[PDB]
Amino acid sequence: MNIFEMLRIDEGLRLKIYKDTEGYYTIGIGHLLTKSPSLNAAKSELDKAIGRNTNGVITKDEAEKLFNQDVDAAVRGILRNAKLKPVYDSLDAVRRAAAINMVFQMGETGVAGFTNSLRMLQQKRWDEAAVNLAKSRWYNQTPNRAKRVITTFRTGTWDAYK
Numbered sequence: 001m002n003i004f005e006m007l008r009i010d011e012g013l014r015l016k017i018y019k020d021t022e023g024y025y026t027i028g029i030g031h032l033l034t035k036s037p038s039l040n041a042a043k044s045e046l047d048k049a050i051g052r053n054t055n056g057v058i059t060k061d062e063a064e065k066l067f068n069q070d071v072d073a074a075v076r077g078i079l080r081n082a083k084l085k086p087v088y089d090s091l092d093a094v095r096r097a098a099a100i101n102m103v104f105q106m107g108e109t110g111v112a113g114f115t116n117s118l119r120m121l122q123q124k125r126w127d128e129a130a131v132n133l134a135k136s137r138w139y140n141q142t143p144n145r146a147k148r149v150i151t152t153f154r155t156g157t158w159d160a161y162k
């Protein structure tokens with residue numbers, strides 16, 4: 001298992017514009033297009049992301065290209081962030097994947113707001129970070145996915161995904 005397989009499980013694949021759990025226009029493997037209610041605004045972000053006239057539909061290869069870019073941008077956002085980088089460097093490989101999953105979902109600004117959880121992850125207080133992570137809008141809105149990520153941070157294994 002790895003970050004690509006983990007995120008593909010959590011996010012799914014859809015080849016046609018759709019609204020995510022928040023009601024935002026999304027396509028591919030969790031690639032957020034725009035928070036605006038306008039479908040025309042989403043189609044135009046899509047054409048621009050892909051470099052052609054999509055009419056709201058993309059192929060599998062294009063979905064995978066966006067996906068690759070987004071995973072890469074999530075990693076590089078972690079490393080440029082003063083709050084995230086120290087935590088990330090302190091973690092083993094499996095739990096590093098859990099951090100990327102969260103950033104991918106909620107952006108680096110969002111995760112960097114999990115100050116107390118971050119401090120506990122850094123101190124390797126796994127059970128306590130799990131409890132504090134669960135006290136969040138994130139967990140209450142998307143509990144199945146959140147539990148999978150929390151379990152990964154708690155155990156250091158891919159068990160929640162196997």
Ligand SMILES: [Cl-]
Nearest residue numbers: 048049050069
């Ligand atoms: Cl893009």
Ligand SMILES: [Cl-]
Nearest residue numbers: 142143144145
């Ligand atoms: Cl969920």
